[PDB]
């Protein structure tokens, strides 16, 4: 799985296509996942805005 029911660790990077993708790590995981913006932004709407503001 790519959304593996873990807690968000970081938002490392992003890339805008037809969909916006966030490249995020999870807590304990060591791997980076591409996750569509919409999903992550409903799930963790605050750490996202943090990522784009700072």
């Amino acid at each position: 799985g790519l959304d593996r029911g873990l807690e968000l660790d970081k938002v490392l990077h992003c890339y805008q296509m037809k969909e916006l993708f966030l490249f995020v790590t999870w807590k304990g995981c060591s791997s980076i996942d591409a996750v569509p913006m919409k999903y992550i932004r409903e799930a963790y709407p605050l750490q996202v805005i943090e990522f784009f503001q700072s």
Binding site: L2, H13, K18, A34
Partner: peptide, 24 residues
Amino acid sequence: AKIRMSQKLACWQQILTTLGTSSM
């Protein structure tokens, strides 16, 4: 940032899976 290319590819593969190859 000094991310390894295997990780970048794992991401690209996740991207292809999310959009679907037939998409473009």
